[PDB]
Please model this.
Amino acid sequence: MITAQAVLYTQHGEPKDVLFTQSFEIDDDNLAPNEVIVKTLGSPVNPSDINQIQGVFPSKPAKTTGFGTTEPAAPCGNEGLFEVIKVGSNVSSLEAGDWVIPSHVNFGTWRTHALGNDDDFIKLPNPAQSKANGKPNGLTINQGATISVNPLTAYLMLTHYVKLTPGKDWFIQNGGTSAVGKYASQIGKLLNFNSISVIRDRPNLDEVVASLKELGATQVITEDQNNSREFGPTIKEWIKQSGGEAKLALNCVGGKSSTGIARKLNNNGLMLTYGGMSFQPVTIPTSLYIFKNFTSAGFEVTELLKNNKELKTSTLNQIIAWYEEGKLTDAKSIETLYDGTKPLHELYQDGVANSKDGKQLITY
Amino acid sequence: MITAQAVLYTQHGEPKDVLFTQSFEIDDDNLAPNEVIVKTLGSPVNPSDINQIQGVFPSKPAKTTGFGTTEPAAPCGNEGLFEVIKVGSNVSSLEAGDWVIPSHVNFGTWRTHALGNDDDFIKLPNPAQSKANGKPNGLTINQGATISVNPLTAYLMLTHYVKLTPGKDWFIQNGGTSAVGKYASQIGKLLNFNSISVIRDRPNLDEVVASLKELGATQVITEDQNNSREFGPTIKEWIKQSGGEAKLALNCVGGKSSTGIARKLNNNGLMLTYGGMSFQPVTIPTSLYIFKNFTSAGFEVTELLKNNKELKTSTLNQIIAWYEEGKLTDAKSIETLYDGTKPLHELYQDGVANSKDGKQLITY
Model:
């Protein structure tokens, strides 16, 4: 009998206030034919996880008594990497030792173990399988645990909405040093898309710029330069010389930044908003809508993929392969190991609180 | 040999400063086979007309000498009602006495007469023709002179982008007392679309509200109510009881107003921005994009119909029919009759200056 820990809440609110840790048991001698037991390897703290706990995310796991609680409680975390421990008599798609991620949202990944059906999971190659398949790299635990949200977000925003002509057309994005921003630069490079990354000014600007250009940003400018028309002419010349157009804007900041990148688009431009920096609405000049046929839309990967398994699968398969082939690199997470000396929910509360330091991965 | 007057400018700027009237001549004894001569019956002062004269607008008429000016000058006005007075030998589509509007922009409708091709015009039934064919009404001159932009704008925004289910679904619009707002309220009633009109508060609010409801607004609310967090439930209750959804917002104000009507849409809502007050950018909370799959787009009827004659014709025919059936009404213009005792351009200047008193129509 396995004793496991889950991070739960009985009511919505701030993670710092409502989270707690619940012990529960999994009977590993009592497996229905299609059931699978997994043990968590790592799961990150994402803004959408927090939004779920706050009660504002579109989708959230149902509160239930399934963890043996007194009141209905919901689990936390939408993504993470697990190792298959044991499978039921009718399970062929998975076996012990396999790496898996949840097949759907609301699984609850902030916990040590889970019991599910085989179709609750999507198999990733573990490093031994990648090596046997002749691939130059295996996935790391961070790469598997963070593969389902930010890399798919970048890929789908660049490919699913407007068709950029390879070698010619441009996308522009703010939050250039964010996780999704760095994925989009890399994917833009792989797809032969030109791009401008707008970033905040920093002490080590020259280093960040060179680093982002290495990742695949064609040009890197600061927010100041995004908003200066002393700097403006530089950008239209870039687009001019390429023979293409700026067709797509990726916004995760809002406010003045979103206006700035929106103004850089050519006619019939599309902006996708997939994140927002606090109390800043997306602010677009009326003239862009009326005269430049600008469109501003939203992107949220979990809603997009909810009833589109084929799209999820093909996208995920391409990200997995790009990691195996050394074509994509993740940003390093700050990893906190759960050794059982500190309550699991506290590790995740720290992760929420410290997310400003960088991506927080709780590992096991 | 016809003596004609045109309102013109040699330099962009305020109509206050730059407009003047020139005489020019039209030789009616020598028409090319496809040519037509029209006299102006009426043409309005519209926002875009003023914009072209200032120059801030996109598309303008080219500055030439064709009106016999001592310097290159441009004509003013894009909307107008004309009567055919004489056609060329190959003109079958039009006869003397026919009513026509320009088939394209940049026509120059602030003048007494025009010479063009038969394909520069679109035929409308004059009242004699409507009446003879048993129609309960014929077009007034104002209805004909203002039919090409605002009625088409309202009709197309309501029908061309999202399908509102009759009796059930809602659109919401701001600028509820604008010319387009009032057409949209009427068309909504005609097509069984529910609508909320948001309007600025006024000393005679009760009268305006009653008037808009008679035109076809289902509900009318103030910008204060639009801004009210606490009013949310009432509006949700309106939509729930209809068993429909709010699918479509029409924005011509920007700022807080655009925010307020955006928030009132159900998930997967579409906003169309077709106008904007002063400064104001379209301000949309990041959450609408990310959590409610909100889309905000533009509408400009000139670009939409630029190469879609079939759509323009189909739409125009419906507006014409409704005017004839007495099912659609225009807002009354302040009419200023040009009789030659005052320079033509001065009438239009007075029109621009007195624009806040209402739609200004210069008649002939």
Q: What stands out?
A: The two ends of chain B are 19 Å apart (CA to CA). The domain at 148-328 of chain B is CATH 3.40.50.720 (Rossmann fold). Chain B is about 35% helix and 25% strand. Residues 309-324 of chain B form the longest helix (16 residues).
